[PDB]
Nanobody
Framework: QVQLVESGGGLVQAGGSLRLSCAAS????????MGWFRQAPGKEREGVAA????????LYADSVKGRFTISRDKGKNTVYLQMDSLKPEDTATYYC??????????????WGQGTQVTVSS
């Protein structure tokens, strides 16, 4: 139904900055949301950021407020995660998801394969 492709991950220095990209098939759902989630080894997956199709509505996990920014290029159907002031504990697989609500992972029915981010001190 909707396929999602993440890019932009890898090794980065602590204190540094990355921008992740998520390309999606078709067009953004008009009322449901697209989100970034992450899952570190041994831990449950957790929401990072989400937004609506207009782009006006955005929501962030407390852990990343003020450091990460979600946005869209409507010129495509690509959503971005700008990640600044990275910390070692931000190390995780980062996933793009579509068709869900806010940071409620169980409401999303489309998930990317995920992209590794490792933050090196």
């Amino acid at each position: 139904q909707v396929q999602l492709v993440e890019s932009g991950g890898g090794l980065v220095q602590a204190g540094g900055s990355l921008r992740l990209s998520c390309a999606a098939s078709g067009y953004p759902h008009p009322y449901l949301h697209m989100g970034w989630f992450r899952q570190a080894p041994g831990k449950e997956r957790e929401g990072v950021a989400a937004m609506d199709s207009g782009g006006g509505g955005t929501l962030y996990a407390d852990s990343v407020k003020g450091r990460f920014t979600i946005s869209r290029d409507k010129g495509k159907n690509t959503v971005y995660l700008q990640m600044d002031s990275l910390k070692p504990e931000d190390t995780a697989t980062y996933y793009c998801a579509a068709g869900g609500y806010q940071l409620r992972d169980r409401t999303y029915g489309h998930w990317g394969q995920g992209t590794q981010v490792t933050v090196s001190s």
